[PDB]
From a paper:
To our surprise, we discovered that both Itk and Src bind ADP significantly stronger than the non-hydrolysable ATP analogue, AMPPNP. To investigate the preferred binding of ADP at atomic resolution we determined the crystal structure of tail-phosphorylated Src in the presence of ADP and magnesium. Src32K crystallised in the same conditions as previously reported for the nucleotide-free protein and in the same space group. A difference density map of the nucleotide-binding site shows clear electron density for the adenosine, both alpha and beta phosphates, and a single magnesium ion. The magnesium ion is coordinated between the alpha and beta phosphates and Asn391 and Asp404. The beta phosphate is directly coordinated by Arg388, the guanidinium group of which is stabilised by a hydrogen bond network between Asn391, Asp386 and Arg388. While the position of the alpha phosphate is superimposable with that of AMPPNP and the protein has, in principle, a large enough pocket in which to accommodate an additional phosphate, our binding experiments indicate a strong preference for ADP over AMPPNP. In order to rationalise the energetic basis for ADP over ATP binding, we computed the relative binding free energies between ADP and ATP using molecular dynamics simulations. The perturbation of ADP to ATP in the bound state resulted in a free energy difference of -262.9 kJ mol−1 compared with −281.8 kJ mol−1 in the free state. This results in a relative binding free energy for ADP over ATP of −18.9 kJ mol−1, confirming our experimental findings. Whilst the crystal structure of Src in complex with ADP shows minimal differences to AMPPNP-bound Src, molecular dynamics calculations of the free energy of binding reinforce the strong preference for ADP.
The structures of Src, Hck, and Abl kinases show a conserved intramolecular assembly of their regulatory SH3, SH2, and kinase domains that maintains the kinase in an autoinhibited conformation. Src and Tec kinases are activated by engagement of intracellular ligands for their SH2 and SH3 domains, events that promote activation loop phosphorylation and downstream signalling. The interface between the regulatory and kinase domains is mediated by a variable linker between the SH2 and kinase domains that forms a network of interactions essential for maintaining the inactive state. In summary, we present a general mechanism for the allosteric activation and autoinhibition of both Src and Tec family tyrosine kinases.
Numbering used by the authors: 81 to 529
Write the structure that this text describes.
Amino acid sequence: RMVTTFVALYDYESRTETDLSFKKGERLQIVNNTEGDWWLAHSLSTGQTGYIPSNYVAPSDSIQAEEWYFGKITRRESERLLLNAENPRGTFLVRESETTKGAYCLSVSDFDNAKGLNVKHYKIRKLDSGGFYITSRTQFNSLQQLVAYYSKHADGLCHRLTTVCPTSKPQTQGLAKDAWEIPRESLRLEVKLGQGCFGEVWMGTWNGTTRVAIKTLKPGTMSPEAFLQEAQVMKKLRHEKLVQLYAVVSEEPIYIVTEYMNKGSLLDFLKGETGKYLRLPQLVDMSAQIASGMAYVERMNYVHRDLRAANILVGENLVCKVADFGLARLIEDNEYTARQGAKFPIKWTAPEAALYGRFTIKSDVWSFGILLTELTTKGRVPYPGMVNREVLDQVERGYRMPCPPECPESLHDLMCQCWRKEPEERPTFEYLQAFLEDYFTSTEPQYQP
Ligand SMILES: Nc1ncnc2c1ncn2[C@@H]1O[C@H](COP(=O)(O)OP(=O)(O)O)[C@@H](O)[C@H]1O
Ligand SMILES: [Mg+2]
């Protein structure tokens, strides 16, 4: 539209030559309201120029520039951030209301003798004049004044506003502008994060600036021609609960570069000291994150084909994202193609997918039901007293895992819905997400009056 002045929200190290290195606070000259994930910018601070990630800047002198404004973040995700144990009382953020378009919301962390650590949500009424107010008896001209005022007096709020909600730098959309197929010499593998059946995983760095996860397929796993073909679709899948596909190295051995999840896989995270303190409310919430990512996959008319706790990756504040979606199809192994052998996840595979190769989003729904048993058992293998060989015949005859101990029979009933024989009667991920987000009377409710 018209080159305007922007401000940097976070630091960013120049990963390439064409991008722009800038620190939080730098005034940037960018073409206003220009579509894309990478915008051309001119730094009025350093006089340097280059492309910048569009989610690292906001118009100067706008609410988006304020560090306590989190934009279109959900009530459920705001609570995740605010309920962090290291946040003091009065840790807050401002966001948009999900139940009242045009209104804002002040989310604040608080402590109570009944609930303990909880978040209070206060709706902010914006006026035609531009003024904001939480209660009728105290009003302000700007959202900034409101924050300043309640940072000195609770005056009705559960607690004075103390700290702004901590946040980690968001992901850029792609490693760089036009960056997709990269050379192997651009990746530097630093730490082996783990090992799979068809290759290894690595913590590395691209251009020695940005930390990424590098998956290395052993030769013969999949043809580069078909991997690149499918990778043009996986690069389109962008959602907060999907691990982002960054780049690829075409020449075998194929390397897959993805966003790095520091807490490891959900399965391992459910075991050991990490999973000791997890309680059902957190497991249900983690299920809702997974269902949200799969609901996006469901909207894009895509199929995961290998949904299981081992392919869910954990981050800070118990963030969970779906990983390794769409790779299972490209496996060239004759035994995995015919879903046989000790390397096929038969215990997460719907019977019609294992018997007739009918992989659909509904067979992922089946997999989700299995995944829920891993969550409510903290990593226990499905069908524990059964070997792969015998699972498919038992579920084909109608056997279903019973309600695990420490699993509410209401969630096992959800599991059995996912385990219906008829795929088209299995529920959607839109349903599962809403069900699991509202499991504890948690359906968008109760802004404090
Ligand atoms: N994007 C990632 N970020 C951080 N760690 C990862 C990532 N992807 C995989 N890992 C780690 O590497 C290991 C191997 O992953 P993978 O080869 O997909 O094994 P599988 O899918 O069979 O569990 C996992 O246990 C996980 O902890
Ligand atoms: Mg995997």
